[PDB]
Amino acid sequence: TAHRFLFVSTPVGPLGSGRGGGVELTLPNLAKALTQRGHQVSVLAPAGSVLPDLPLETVPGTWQSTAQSHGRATPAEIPAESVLARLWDRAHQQQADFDLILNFAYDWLPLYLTPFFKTPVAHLISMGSLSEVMDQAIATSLDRYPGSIAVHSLAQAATFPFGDRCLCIGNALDLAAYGFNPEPEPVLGWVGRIAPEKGLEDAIQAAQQAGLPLRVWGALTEPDYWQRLQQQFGDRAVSYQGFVSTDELQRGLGRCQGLLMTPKWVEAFGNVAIEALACGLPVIAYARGGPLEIIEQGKSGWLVEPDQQAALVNAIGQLSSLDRAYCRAQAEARFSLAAMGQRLEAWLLPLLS
């Protein structure tokens, strides 16, 4: 049952550098999810990539732009020195060393190339139906290779006309790196860019009105914003906890009574919610996007109406009705590498040969 996989990373940026999007966090966990079952995983990724403990080969070139120029009719683009093209030309040279190649990129090229490979190629789609050129490439790959496409959510699968023929593998997190904290301080947390248009003001005003300091984790780009926040809400409002590593983020976040999540719909990913549950921290989130699949209403968090102070404050007031051990228990059951590995095997192993 042990096999050899090659993972081909996203062209959007390096692993380990803060700017491959969500694929940057998922690729290493999925690799671990298989290496922990005895499989070999090697990784191909852009120059500058860092990844502990796995064979890693890096490839030079220009990062794929997130662009989206003319909406749904945007064509696929290949610039000179495309890192995406060179990743796939390199994967093709070495294809006979692997039983299967797993693509993490959301792009036309790898889907198109799939029949030109003798080794089977599977695709983990991380968005979002976004363009005709992409929707048609995935549909065609599905017709020739049933079972070759997976998604992380049903919501994302439903944005595609062929969504029922994609497999859902869910989300995973390296739970070993997250300590359960059953005894928090009377503080709330918020995770994200300390910048305008992130819903930070909504979190601050609801924490303060609820009577609890807000700790924040993330990147400060404009110090004048920090000052504006102080002038709006005073200097006991928000406490800067750092940009800060995974291990640092988890002991910090774990001491919170709850995590507030107030992002715009286009930034409403579920990743940080999982990290919160893993520390035993319940989540109060706007009831749209990624959190709707992570949080169990009245049990592991509260899903509230967007942009309404009273809904945040009513939720914060009811954090004590949620059991922190149940949050952790849900993370162990739903989002572990163990759970993920089994879902990967179910998906991939029928594709071998």
Positions in the binding site for a copy of itself (CB under 8 A): 73, 75-82, 85, 89, 92-93, 108, 112-113, 115-117, 131-133, 135-136
Q: Which tokens in the block code for residue 16? A: 């380990």
Counting Cα atoms < 13 Å in the Cβ hemisphere of 9 gives 36
* Candidate segments 6-14, 91-99, 150-158, 271-279, binder of ligand UDP by CB under 6 A: 271-279
Beta carbon of residue 75, minimum distance to a copy of itself (angstroms, whole number): 4
Query: What is the size of the binding site for ligand UDP (CB under 6 A)?
Result: 16
User: What does 73 bind: a copy of itself, ligand UDP, none (CB cut-off 5 to 8 Å by kind)?
Assistant: a copy of itself
Return the number of the residue (89 or 247) whose C-beta is nearest a copy of itself. Answer: 89
Which of the listed partners (ligand UDP, a copy of itself, none) does 97 bind, with a CB threshold of 5 to 8 Å by partner kind?
Answer: none
329 three-state secondary structure: helix
Q: Is 94 helix (H, G, I), strand (E, B) or coil?
A: coil
Supply the minimum distance, in Å, between the C-beta of residue 142 and ligand UDP.
22
Which residues from 98-157 bind ligand UDP, rule CB under 6 A? none
Nearer to ligand UDP, 104 or 217 (CB): 217
Pair type for strands 149-151 and 121-125:
parallel
- The tokens describing 303, both together, are 């899903």
Contact 201, 214 (CB under 8 A): no
Stretch that binds ligand UDP, among 117-125, 131-139, 188-196, 229-237 (CB under 6 A): 188-196
Give the separation between CA 57 and CA 238, rounded to whole angstroms: 42
Give residue 157's identity as a one-letter amino acid code: A
Annotate each residue in 6-45 with x if it binds ligand UDP (CB under 6 A) or - if it does not, as one string.
Answer: ---------------xx--x--------------------
The correct pick among 44, 100, 105, 249 for binding ligand UDP (CB under 6 A) is 249
Q: Which of 301, 305, 306 is nearest to 257 (CA)?
A: 301
* Among the listed residues 13, 218, 258, 290, the single contact to ligand UDP using CB under 6 A: 218
- State the amino acid at position 144 in one-letter form: R
65-97 in b/e form (b: 16+ CB < 10 A) is eeeeeeeeeeeeeeeeebbbbbbbebbbeebee
CB of 63 to ligand UDP, least distance (A): 15
Select the binding partner of residue 2 from a copy of itself, ligand UDP, none (C-beta < 5 to 8 A, by kind).
none
- End-to-end Cα distance, the chain: 13
Q: Which residues pair with 149 in a beta bridge?
A: 123
**Binding-site ranges for ligand UDP (CB under 6 A):** 21-22, 25, 191-193, 217-218, 243-244, 246, 249, 268, 271-272, 275
